[PDB]
């Protein structure tokens, strides 16, 4: 990695790179080594660098990708019920970047009665913030929960849920931002495609953008679990008892 000097007493790392280490911030301790020679340092950062090792050599599937809360926040943003006005969208993009990235705001998905952008447009801007960025991604993927379309003849993106992801020209056209699309082990991942098509730096930039956006967005959006999410319905009690 590249060192970043911080005030506290812990080794901090991006949660995206926890999977290759198998770390889970439960008291885990990791060893840091500082190479002392120029050749060793160059070899370390060029062969063992995080950007150069986003795929496991055992199968080639991506291994550095979104963790739990990042996946949940991405899904909640890309959820079909998510609509954002101009101010909310620009604040989302500023949180996605550090406030130091230019964004070309696309025309809103809804133009009347209000100018509303969907969360899929937010993630399309996450992939390709502006016209200067070269990342043009074309992708077809199945989300892990994909209920098929109402007819056998209908194409896969007509799924009753947003279970099929279509990306054309870095524009997300259908599907939610799932684990199968942003997580590890899938060779149809957005970050896997960005990597294989435009470089580890572009893939890492997309990953950082997504991580910052999710970290700043989930807290303000609100996502919680309680007893009511596990409490059975009253009809379920009777059904279960008879069954």
């Amino acid at each position: 990695h590249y060192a970043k000097i911080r005030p506290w007493r812990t080794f901090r790392l991006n949660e995206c790179v926890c999977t290759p280490y198998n770390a889970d911030f439960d008291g885990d301790e990791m060893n840091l080594h500082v190479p002392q020679t120029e050749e060793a340092r160059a070899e370390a950062i060029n062969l063992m660098g995080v950007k150069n090792n986003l795929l496991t050599p055992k199968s080639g599937e991506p291994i550095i990708a979104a963790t739990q809360d990042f996946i949940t926040g991405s899904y909640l943003i890309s959820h079909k019920d998510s609509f954002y006005d101009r101010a909310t969208l620009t604040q989302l993009l500023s949180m996605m970047s550090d406030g130091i990235e230019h964004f070309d705001i696309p025309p809103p998905a809804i133009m009347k009665p209000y100018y509303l952008w969907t969360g899929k447009q937010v993630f399309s801007l996450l992939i390709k913030p502006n016209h200067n960025s070269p990342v043009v991604i074309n992708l077809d993927a199945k989300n892990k929960v994909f209920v098929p379309p109402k007819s056998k003849s209908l194409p896969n993106e007509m799924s009753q849920n947003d279970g099929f992801v279509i990306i054309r020209g870095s524009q997300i056209l259908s599907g939610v931002m799932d684990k199968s699309v942003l997580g590890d082990g899938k060779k149809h991942s957005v970050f896997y495609t960005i990597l294989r098509d435009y470089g580890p730096q572009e893939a890492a930039n997309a990953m950082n953008r997504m991580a910052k956006l999710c970290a700043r967005f989930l807290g303000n959006r609100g996502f919680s679990i309680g007893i009511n999410d596990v409490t059975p319905a009253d009809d379920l009690k009777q059904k279960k008892e008879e069954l």
Binding site: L55, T56, P57, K58, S59, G60, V136, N138, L139, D140, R168, G169, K187, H188, T193, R196, D197
Partner: protein, 98 residues
């Protein structure tokens, strides 16, 4: 029990394949310069670089990406035979190279 039992297994496997490296003539050789594989996997292909199901190229995604990158509503679609002539004009020099 698995911890230690599997720990030696990994080290033992490494001890056997510790000095196996791809050479510059595309052969896998021991540290004694003896041939184990004349070509890695009979393919010469790195498993880290396969985009398909254990294949180097995902043809469907590649075709979709190429069509989108090169898309232009003002462009004459080739006849079905002409697509084949372009394909055989690009591939086929490479084919008789072998």
């Amino acid at each position: 029990v698995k911890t230690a039992e599997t720990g030696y297994m990994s080290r033992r496997l490494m001890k056997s394949l510790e000095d196996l490296s791809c050479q510059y003539d595309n052969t896998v050789r021991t540290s004694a310069n003896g041939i184990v594989q004349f070509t890695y996997g009979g393919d010469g292909l790195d498993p880290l670089e396969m985009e398909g199901n254990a294949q180097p190229v995902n043809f469907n995604r590649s075709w979709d990406h190429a069509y989108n990158i090169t898309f232009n509503n003002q462009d004459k679609g080739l006849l079905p035979y002409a697509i084949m002539e372009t394909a055989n004009e690009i591939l086929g020099p490479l084919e008789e190279r072998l």
